[PDB]
Design a protein around this ligand. Structure first.
Ligand SMILES: NC(=O)C1=CN([C@@H]2O[C@H](COP(=O)(O)OP(=O)(O)OC[C@H]3O[C@@H](n4cnc5c(N)ncnc54)[C@H](OP(=O)(O)O)[C@@H]3O)[C@@H](O)[C@H]2O)C=CC1
Ligand SMILES: CCCCCCCCCCCC(=O)OC[C@H](COP(=O)(O)OCC[N+](C)(C)C)OC(=O)CCCCCCCCCCC
Ligand SMILES: CCCCCCCCCCCC(=O)OC[C@H](COP(=O)(O)OCC[N+](C)(C)C)OC(=O)CCCCCCCCCCC
Ligand SMILES: CCCCCCCCCCCC(=O)OC[C@H](COP(=O)(O)OCC[N+](C)(C)C)OC(=O)CCCCCCCCCCC
Ligand code: SF4
Ligand code: SF4
Ligand code: SF4
Ligand SMILES: [Zn+2]
Lengths: 160, 124, 139, 115, 368, 175, 111, 90, 112
């Protein structure tokens, strides 16, 4: 809702907001997000439009295989996309999406080449686990297991 | 004789034996590349000491199979068009000139094309 | 699907010998219409029973009685078993079949834990050749 | 959020005289915990050999003159001290740390390949 | 071990082959050598296989126990360590192990006889068959490991068969066979130290009176690495032993203080740390368990060997000929008896015994 | 001291059953091999995405418990170690200690490209290039991740190997 | 698996596209002129312990020479058996050719 | 609105005859589905046996053979330039 | 500049006492008319005289022990490359790029 992306501005859904800020509220929110996601999936099935699924630009998107074996220009673009890749204009970006774990963002630095110069991956689980000391202090040992579960921690995301 | 088993040749001077495990392929004795390691030398390793050589992967030599295909002769045209005989599941379509008095193979499939006017010259 | 009546129907259709073999490997008594056999000898069936669940309408009867191996299923029927297609390889059109210029042998399963296990090796010759020494006498 | 045990607040010391005292204070802390290092990691050497090793590592940076380099060296030494005292290192790492060991002539390197 | 074991990157074997080493001497490096380690799943075998395979030398390990060979493959990279299922009563299996090998190390030997093999069959028959098969395969180097008191005229079956084994190997393989006579070896899970660490050691007054010259097992494996890759060691006999002579009674009491069994005065006697028994009773018990117990126990021959001390053949060669200084047991005693300490567990303070501490403890043991 | 070793006695894996004691110890082995094959207890050692496919083996669709497979949280109660995920240098000492704490008999399964040879992170500064550098591996399961059926096939291969064990007949014939 | 033409000739022309795309660098290719002059490879290795089974090599192949079969039951006792050379990959192509044809006939239009 | 839906309108295998009447009596929520996909409806034509003839979709302004100059749609090379404002320009 | 930043970088001592880095600007390829790659200064390390590459016998893989064999740093100016090499205390040498002499070229010269 704060920064719509990829047709999320053309479907209707609601967000559940807690009041007490504890694990039970977060469980209820994740169950509402279950039903809201099912609500979105139904709309996507009905509203799926025709057309290409990738950008109509063969300098970035690979051409179709049938067109590759008949067209001279398609073969060249197919050859270069898989051997050298496509160059990205120099610059930097910070793109964030509403990941199921929270806010997942990538800080990608481009130098005008075909390889990213820097790719910082922002993990919501990495930030959630950093607050574990502030949140789990004073609770008992079985409460820590619940707090770990309520943060939805996947340690590949944390240790990317 | 271990000279036909370790040297690259255009043709095998004898008939390949399908049951012989020292051949490069079941249908070909000699290797078909100058940098291709002979199978007999490769199998003479410590890792084959207690291993049955019959069950090892021994695919047929493609060089002997491709030359069993008859030459395609084109009538009233000096250009041959080949795309793998499969279309979308073949290879990129290429055009082969047939002006020269010989069969010219495809750059991908290896199928050889020639004009019918040169059929007598090629076969002899 | 887990009812005792289904087991009794399959017990009657299969018979004692067929069901007892299923009671040794399959952990379940099942019956179905024969679809075909592969080169290794395995038999493949399809179940018309309405009480069978989605993913359990196709099954194999292995040749062995005490041990079963999934790799023994021929590549022709491996795709059919996994619900990849509705056309069994024995029902394939002549143009849909694969054309091999090389002869076909009996299906060979996975050869691990045996003496026939695949042994990797380098298929390329050494990149440098040493000098063959020769002696020439000085004048 | 409470910092872990033996955690110090990172600070950039702008006085060379003050930096010398901090190194000396940290040097004594290493010596006092030498027996603890032997007990926690179950070393095969007595605590006397540990203190000799600690002195040798400290003497390697005795003649460092640049103050900005001293702050980084002191900061990393504090991090190393915290790692050892809190038993965060595995026993294998400490064993290999003390498992550190006349060079070969020209011909000896030549006959074997050298570098 | 070091970083590169070979003294040169090009080595010519006794059979004429030229072997070139590649790499700096790590896991991915190679030495160009292929070696067969008979009995590589034993105590000394694992040390030998680890040293050979860690530098890239191809190792062929004949084996009879399937579970015991699994841990050997970790030593080397992919394709370095190879296994062949073998039996000394199967001639074809032995000939397959040495077909591609430039070096054959015979570590097969036993102190007991079982329902299937006698002492002669393993110490003499197995060694002869391996040596003769190695020569017919054109193996450049053969290394045979006998015992420390090898003597063909000895009254002990173990020492006599080891003595005959030395002669039968040299006759079959030829004068180019190197023979190693290692002393009792101390190491982690070492048979020489396992007997001393056993709380209920029956007949300690009769058994623990033997005097030996214990040698580090890591050095014995290191010495074999030196011998295999040095053709100047062919045809020689090496006696591997430590400088300091020890009696098992001194080691037994020194260990007792390290384990801190004596923290309770009553406990060592109550727990059975001393089991004085007459030798005729020990002979009867050893004779009975030779046909009742399914696991190798203290047998009759080992009872004889308790009265025989280790005598060093002066004519043979030592670590000095191989350019090594023998390790002292006092330095490595603590780290190999440390696992058996009763409590420790960093309660108050670990008592780490250094080289000087062990020597002082030896004086306390002999002090009445 | 004369020794006459027979020359053509087949090895244990080829040796047929001749006398009555051969069938006795083969019966002893099969009773144990059946018990260990049937009571296949892996240890809960999920490291990375390979563990997700390991969870789906316990899912109702495959139901590993139907084969007698129960995951145990302690190395003492488990005889199978499934390395499902990436093994890092920071993790390697912990993996070795947990492996050593498993009582014998014990087996190790290497699942996924990370555990087999490092996979996507083969050229990483902090990744072990294969769990076999630390522990002996009995079976390697390929895939990224291996499917739930791929892992089950690997377990079946290990159970086939376990049923061929001859521990007690080895004592009778080989020792 | 490495596939063949219906005449038996290898499909691959040693173009080295798959080796370049491979995110894990699991493919090693060495090539030269064949004895008859064809552009063919004499060394094609895939480290199955290094591959991430991602399909980039299949997508980049201009002649559909390198494909991935639906096979998953090939777990091996030793890690060496997971180092496929050209002989292993070509044998897999011959063994699984019929099943690959099933997948191609249904998925090629979408490519 | 996603209100309650009767069980027979959901693509799951259900009960028949007397066993359907018994299920309605005993189940607390009779309109819930058992979750077993219909064998006669779910994935009955497998993806490998679909009869649909796929065709690559192409838009007219950007995928036609005429009036389709590439630089008119070359958005990648018409990217915004990076401009920084210092205190002098402000 | 004068600060010995290698004391805190953590890199092994062999990078200073045993390895030589080359500061260079990439030369124009003889097979192509593009000059984009020649606009940046790069730093790479000289190969080890032994162990740079050797053949693995199992699969023919190119084994190596040089951990810097695949590292190529990119710089926008020559001065920046020198300043970084000096800062890390590396033993280096500069290969000055070859400059193409300018010669007038016109179509009239094809006849005159
Ligand atoms: N303190 C010591 O240990 C000393 C060692 N030695 C000798 O050094 C050599 C190495 O032995 P060590 O490692 O120290 O301890 P072990 O006695 O446990 O080693 C014996 C080795 O030989 C094998 N072996 C014994 N009998 C047979 C047989 N019939 N068939 C096949 N293999 C057999 C064993 O294989 P497996 O394990 O599979 O049964 C094992 O690998 C031995 O010969 C020993 O006599 C002599 C003096 C001191
Ligand atoms: C219950 C009976 C146990 C008797 C075991 C025994 O008699 O075992 C001992 C012998 C010797 O063979 P070993 O155990 O390998 O010798 C090694 C151990 N020693 C040297 C200490 C003896 O074995 C046999 O004669 C096997 C007879 C098997 C009978 C059927 C069971
Ligand atoms: C109550 C306990 C029942 C034990 C069940 C397991 C038995 C088993 O595993 O039996 C395995 C054994 C032997 O091996 P085999 O399979 O016959 O192989 C041998 C192959 N011959 C037959 C060609 C040689 O068979 C028996 O003759 C067991 C006799 C038991 C009395
Ligand atoms: C008393 C303690 C408590 C009870 C414990 C019982 C444990 C269960 C038994 C283990 C089962 C097992 O292992 O049977 C599995 C094995 C198969 O072995 P495989 O490796 O798959 O094939 C190898 C075998 N071939 C080569 C023959 C294929 O079946 C058999 O060979 C069964 C045949 C033996 C004869 C059976 C009838 C004889 C009477 C037996 C009853 C008295
Ligand atoms: S092999 Fe693939 S699926 Fe398995 S842990 Fe590694 S990246 Fe994840
Ligand atoms: S599927 Fe495997 S081999 Fe093919 S490109 Fe991807 S990682 Fe490389
Ligand atoms: S992409 Fe295809 S044709 Fe090109 S090298 Fe790879 S397998 Fe051969
Ligand atoms: Zn063609």
């Amino acid at each position: 809702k704060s920064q719509p992306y990829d047709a999320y501005d053309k479907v209707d859904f609601d967000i559940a907001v807690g009041t007490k800020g504890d694990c039970y509220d977060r469980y209820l929110i994740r169950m509402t997000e279950f039903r809201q996601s099912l609500r979105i999936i139904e709309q996507c099935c009905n509203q799926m439009p025709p057309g290409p699924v990738k950008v109509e630009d063969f300098k970035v998107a690979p051409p179709p295989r049938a067109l590759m074996k008949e067209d001279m220009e398609a073969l060249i673009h197919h050859f270069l996309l898989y051997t050298k890749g496509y160059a990205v204009p120099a610059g930097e970006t910070y793109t964030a999406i509403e990941a199921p774990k929270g806010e997942m963002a990538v800080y990608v630095v481009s130098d005008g080449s075909e390889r990213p110069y820097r790719c910082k991956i922002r993990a919501p689980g990495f930030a959630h686990l950093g607050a574990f000391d502030h949140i789990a202090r004073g609770h008992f040992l079985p409460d820590a297991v619940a707090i770990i579960g309520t943060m939805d921690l996947v340690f590949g995301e944390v240790d990317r | 004789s271990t000279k036909e088993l370790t040297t690259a040749r255009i043709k095998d001077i004898s008939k390949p034996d399908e049951n012989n495990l020292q051949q490069q392929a079941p249908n070909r004795i000699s290797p078909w590349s100058k940098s291709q390691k002979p199978r007999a030398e490769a199998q003479d390793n410590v890792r084959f000491a207690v291993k049955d050589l019959a069950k090892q992967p021994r695919p047929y030599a493609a060089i002997d199979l491709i030359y069993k295909q008859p030459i395609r002769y084109i009538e009233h045209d000096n250009v041959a068009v080949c795309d793998g005989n499969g279309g979308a599941q073949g290879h990129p379509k290429v055009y082969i000139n047939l002006d020269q008095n010989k069969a010219i193979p495809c750059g991908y499939c290896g199928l050889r094309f020639a004009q019918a006017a040169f059929k007598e010259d090629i076969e002899s | 699907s887990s009812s005792i009546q289904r087991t009794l129907r399959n017990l009657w259709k299969n018979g004692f010998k067929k069901s007892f073999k299923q009671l040794q490997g399959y952990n379940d008594i099942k019956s179905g219409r024969l679809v075909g056999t592969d080169s290794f000898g395995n038999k493949f069936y399809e179940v018309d029973d309405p009480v069978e669940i989605h993913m359990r309408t196709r099954f194999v009867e292995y040749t062995g009685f005490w041990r079963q191996d999934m790799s023994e299923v021929e590549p022709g029927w491996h795709y059919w078993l996994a619900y990849g297609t509705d056309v069994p390889p024995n029902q394939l059109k002549p143009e849909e079949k694969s054309v091999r210029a090389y002869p076909v042998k009996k299906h060979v399963p996975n050869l691990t834990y045996t003496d026939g296990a695949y042994v990797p090796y380098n298929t390329a010759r050494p990149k440098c050749a040493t000098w063959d020494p020769k002696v020439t006498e000085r004048p | 959020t409470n910092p872990t045990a033996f955690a110090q607040t990172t600070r950039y010391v702008k006085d060379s005289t003050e930096m010398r005292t901090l190194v000396l204070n940290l040097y004594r802390r290493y010596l006092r915990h030498s027996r603890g290092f032997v007990n926690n990691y179950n070393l095969d050497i007595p605590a006397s050999q540990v203190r000799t090793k600690i002195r040798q590592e400290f003497e390697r940076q005795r003649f460092v003159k640049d103050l900005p380099l001293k702050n980084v060296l002191y900061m990393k030494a504090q991090m190393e001290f915290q790692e050892l005292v809190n038993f965060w290192k595995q026993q294998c790492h400490v064993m290999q740390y003390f498992e550190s060991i006349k060079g070969d002539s020209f011909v000896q390197k030549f006959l074997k390949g050298a570098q | 071990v070091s970083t590169f074991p070979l003294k040169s990157d090009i080595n010519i074997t006794k059979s004429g082959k030229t072997l070139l080493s590649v790499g700096q001497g790590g896991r991915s490096s190679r030495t160009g050598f292929t070696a067969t380690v008979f009995g590589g799943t034993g105590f000394l075998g694992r040390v030998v296989v680890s040293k050979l395979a860690k530098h890239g030398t191809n190792v062929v390990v004949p084996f009879r126990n399937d579970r015991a060979r699994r841990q050997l493959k970790v030593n080397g990279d992919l394709g370095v360590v190879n296994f062949v299922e073998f039996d000394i009563r199967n001639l074809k299996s032995i000939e397959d192990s040495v077909k591609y090998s430039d070096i054959v190390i015979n570590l097969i030997g036993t102190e007991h006889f079982s329902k299937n093999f006698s002492i002669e069959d393993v110490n003499i028959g197995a060694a002869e068959r391996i040596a003769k098969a190695a020569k017919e395969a054109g193996v450049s180097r053969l290394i045979h490991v006998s015992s420390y008191n090898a003597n063909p005229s000895s009254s002990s079956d173990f020492y006599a068969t080891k003595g005959i084994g030395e002669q039968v190997v040299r006759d079959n393989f030829g004068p180019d066979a190197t023979i190693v006579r290692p002393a009792p070896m101390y190491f982690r899970n070492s048979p020489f130290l396992n007997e001393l660490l056993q709380i209920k050691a029956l007949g300690g007054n009769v058994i623990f009176k033997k005097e030996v010259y214990p040698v580090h097992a890591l050095q014995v494996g290191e010495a074999i690495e030196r011998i295999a890759f040095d053709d100047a060691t062919a045809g020689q006999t090496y006696e591997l032993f430590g400088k300091e002579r020890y009696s098992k009674k001194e080691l037994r009491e020194m260990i007792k203080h390290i384990i801190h069994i004596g923290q309770r005065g009553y406990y060592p006697y109550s727990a059975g740390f001393y089991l004085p028994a007459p030798e005729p009773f020990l002979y009867a018990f050893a004779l009975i368990r030779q046909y009742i117990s399914s696991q190798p126990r203290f047998n009759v021959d080992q009872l004889k060997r308790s009265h025989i001390n280790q005598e060093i053949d002066q004519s043979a060669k030592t670590f000095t000929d191989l350019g090594m200084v023998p390790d002292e047991l006092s330095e490595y005693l603590y780290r190999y008896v440390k696992p058996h300490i009763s409590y420790t567990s960093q309660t108050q303070n670990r008592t780490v015994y250094s080289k000087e501490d062990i020597e002082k403890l030896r004086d306390y043991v002999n002090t009445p | 001291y004369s020794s006459d070793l027979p020359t053509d006695i087949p090895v244990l894996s080829k040796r047929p059953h001749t006398n009555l004691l051969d069938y006795t110890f083969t019966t002893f082995d099969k009773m144990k091999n059946w018990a260990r094959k049937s009571s296949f207890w892996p240890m809960t050692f999920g490291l990375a995405c390979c563990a997700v496919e390991m969870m789906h083996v316990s899912a109702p669709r495959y139901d590993q418990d139907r084969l007698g497979i129960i995951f145990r949280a302690s190395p003492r109660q488990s005889d199978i170690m499934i390395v499902a995920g990436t093994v890092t240098n920071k993790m390697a000492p912990a993996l070795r200690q947990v492996y050593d704490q498993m009582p014998y008999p014990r087996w190790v399964i290497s699942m996924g490209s990370c555990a087999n040879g490092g996979g996507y992170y083969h050229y990483s500064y902090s990744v072990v290039r294969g769990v076999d550098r630390i522990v002996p591996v009995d079976i390697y399961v390929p895939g990224c991740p291996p499917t739930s059926e791929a892992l089950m096939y690997g377990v079946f291969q290990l159970q086939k190997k376990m049923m061929d064990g001859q521990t007690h007949r080895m004592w009778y014939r080989s020792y | 698996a490495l596939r063949r033409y219906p005449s038996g000739e290898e499909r691959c022309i040693a173009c080295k596209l798959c080796e370049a795309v491979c995110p894990a660098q699991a493919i090693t290719i060495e090539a030269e002129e064949r004895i008859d002059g064809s552009r063919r490879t004499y060394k094609y290795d895939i480290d199955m312990t290094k591959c991430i089974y991602c399909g980039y090599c299949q997508e980049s192949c201009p002649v559909d020479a390198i494909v991935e079969t639906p096979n998953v039951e090939y777990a091996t006792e030793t890690r060496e058996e997971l180092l496929y050379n050209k002989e292993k990959l070509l044998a897999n192509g011959d063994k699984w050719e019929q099943e690959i044809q099933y997948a191609l006939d249904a998925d090629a239009p979408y490519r | 609105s996603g209100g309650p839906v009767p069980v027979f309108k959901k693509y799951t295998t259900g009960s028949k005859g007397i066993w359907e009447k018994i299920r309605q009596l005993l189940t607390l929520v009779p309109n819930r589905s058992t979750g077993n996909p219909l064998v006669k409806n779910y994935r009955v034509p497998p993806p490998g046996s679909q009869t649909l003839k796929y065709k690559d979709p192409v838009t007219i302004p950007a995928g036609d053979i005429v009036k389709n100059q590439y630089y008119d749609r070359d958005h990648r090379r018409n990217y915004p330039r990076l401009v920084a404002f210092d205190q002098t320009k402000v | 500049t004068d600060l010995a930043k290698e004391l805190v970088s953590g890199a092994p001592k062999e990078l200073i006492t045993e390895r030589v880095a080359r500061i260079y600007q990439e030369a124009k390829a003889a097979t192509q008319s593009g000059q984009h790659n020649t606009e940046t200064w790069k730093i790479d390390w000289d190969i080890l005289n032994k162990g740079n590459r050797w053949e693995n016998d199992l699969m023919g893989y190119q084994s190596s022990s040089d951990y810097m064999q695949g590292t190529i740093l990119k710089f926008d100016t020559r001065e920046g490359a020198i300043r970084f090499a000096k800062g890390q205390g590396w033993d280096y040498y500069i290969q000055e790029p070859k400059v193409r002499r300018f010669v007038k070229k016109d179509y009239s010269a094809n006849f005159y």
